[PDB]
Amino acid sequence: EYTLEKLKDLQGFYQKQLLDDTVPFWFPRSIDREFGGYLLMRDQDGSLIDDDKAVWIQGRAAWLLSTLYNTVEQKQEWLDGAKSGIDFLNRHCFDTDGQMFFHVTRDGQPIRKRRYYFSETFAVIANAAYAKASGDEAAAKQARYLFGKCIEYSTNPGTRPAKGIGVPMIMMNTAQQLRETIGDPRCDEWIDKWINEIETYFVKDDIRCVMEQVAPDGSIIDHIDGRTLNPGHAIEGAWFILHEAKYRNNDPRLIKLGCKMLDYMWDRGWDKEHGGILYFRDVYNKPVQEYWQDMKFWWPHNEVIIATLLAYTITGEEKYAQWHKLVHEYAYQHFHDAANGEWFGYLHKDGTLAQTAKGNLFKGPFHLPRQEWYCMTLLNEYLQQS
C-alpha cells in the first residue's frame, strides 16, 4: 500500500528527477543565443541531430520555464529563457494570414504549416505563464486574444464527418492554465461545455471505452480510423477532468467521470504480456493498422502516471495506487537514461529501445517534466493536508 511514508519518498523522487536530471538535460544549453528559441532535437548524449525548431515545442518549453519560475524557484535564467521562446514565437512563427506555423528553421523560416491550431494553444499557455512570471502585460493580452481565436476555431470550422476528442481536451487544459496563471472570465463556462462534449459523445459506458473519433451524432464509425483508440490520450483527458474536480472542491460527478475514463482505458491499454501502455488499440479488437500501434512511447506513460496518482490522492482507492506503482516502475525502468539523463522516446512492444533520440519534431521538454512537476506539486499539497 501507499503509506504517507512512501508518498513522501515519491515526492522527493519526482522533485530530484525534475531538478537534477530532467531540466538540466535541456537547460540552459538548449537556449539559442544567436536566433532565440531553443535547439531541442537532440540525441541520447545531448548532441544535436537537427537545428530545426518545432513551433509547438517552442511554446511548450517557454511554458515550462515560466511555470518552474512561478512555482518552484524564481531563477532569472528560467525567466530569460522563457522570454527567448516568447520572442521567437512572435517574431517568426506567424504566417501572413495570422495562423501559426508548425515547423521552422533555426532562423525562423517556414518549413510546414498545419490545418490545426494546436500551435496557438501552446502559445496561449506560454504567454499566460510568462505574463504571470514577468508581469508583461503584452503577453497577458496576447494570451487572452489567442484564446478567443481558438474558441472561434473550435466552434466555427468527404462524406464521413467525424469529431475528435483532441479539441475539447486541448481547449480544456488551455483554459485551465489560463485560469491558474492570469485568469480570464470565459474559462469556467467553456470548460463546462468541453467536459460535457467529452462525456456526451466520447465516453461509452456500455462497452467501457473512450473513443478518439465519433460521428457528429456520437455514433461509432466502424472503419479502420474510426475504431482506433489511443489509451494514453484518453487518460490525459481523464486527469484534466480530475484536476477540474479538485478545483471545484472535489466535485463527485467529475471524479466519477474521470475515474471511469481511467478505468476503461487502463483495461484496454495496459499490455498484459510485456507491461506498459500500448499506443493504439481497436474498439472491437480488430487488428490495428497504424504501424506503431504496439510501440511503447514515453508520453502515454507520463500521462498515466499523473492520472493514477491523482485518482489515488482524491479517492483513496487502493487499485489506483497499484496501477500507479506498475506504470511508474515500468516507465522509469525502461525509458529513463541513467547515463546521460532524461528519457528515450521510443521502445518496441517488448520494451527494447528502438532508437536513441531524446528530442525531435514531437518530443521535447514537456510531457515528462510536466509529469514530474505535477506529481511533486500534488504530493506536496496532499502531505500538507495530512
| Closest to Cl ion by CB, 328 or 367 | 367
Residues 342-371 as x/- pattern, contact with Cl ion by CB under 5 A: ---------------------x--xx----
| Closest to Cl ion by CB, 55 or 245 | 55
**CA distances (Å), origin 253, targets 149, 206, 220, 245, 248:** 30, 18, 25, 8, 10
Residue that is written with C-alpha cell 515560466 in the block: 66
Count of residues engaged in binding Cl ion, rule: CB under 5 A:
3
Rg (C-alpha) for the chain, rounded Å, is: 20
Our finding on whether 239 is near Cl ion (CB under 5 A) is no
Binding site partner of 158, from Cl ion, a second copy, none, Cβ cut-off 5-8 A by kind: a second copy
Report whether the peptide linkage leading into residue 28 is cis, meaning its omega lies within 30 degrees of zero. Answer: yes
In angstroms, give the least distance from the CB of 38 to Cl ion.
Answer: 13
Our finding on whether 374 is near Cl ion (CB under 5 A) is no
- 376: Cβ contacts below 8 Å, ≥ 6 apart: 11, 14, 15, 18
By the 10 Å C-beta count (0-12 exposed, 13-18 middle, 19+ buried), 358 is classed as buried
Our finding on whether 41 is near a second copy (CB under 8 A) is yes
Residue that is written with C-alpha cell 486574444 in the block: 145
Using CB under 8 A, which of the segments 153-161, 261-269, 335-343, 374-382 binds a second copy?
Answer: 153-161
| Closest to a second copy by CB, 168 or 232 | 232
In angstroms, give the least distance from the CB of 357 to Cl ion.
Answer: 12
CA 290 to centroid of chain Cα atoms: 22
In angstroms, give the least distance from the CB of 160 to a second copy.
Answer: 6
Going by C-alpha positions, the residue among 314, 299, 293, 295 that lies closest to residue 233 is 299
Our finding on whether 74 is near a second copy (CB under 8 A) is no
| Closest to Cl ion by CB, 38 or 190 | 38
Query: Which DSSP state fits 358?
Result: S
Q: Which one of residues 133, 288, 307, 376 is an interface residue with a second copy (CB under 8 A)?
A: 288
In angstroms, give the least distance from the CB of 311 to a second copy.
Answer: 29
Count of residues engaged in binding a second copy, rule: CB under 8 A:
33
197-215 burial, b for 16+ CB within 10 Å, e for fewer?
A: bbbebbbeeeeebbbbbbe
Residues 354-383 as x/- pattern, contact with a second copy by CB under 8 A: xxxx--xx----------------------
Evaluate the CA torsion angle 330, 296, 350, 357 in order and state its sign.
negative
Q: Which one of residues 114, 193, 260, 349 is an interface residue with a second copy (CB under 8 A)?
A: 349
- 89: Cβ contacts below 8 Å, ≥ 6 apart: 37, 55, 58, 59, 62, 100, 123, 126
Our finding on whether 49 is near a second copy (CB under 8 A) is yes
Q: Return residues touching Cl ion (CB under 5 A).
A: 363, 366-367
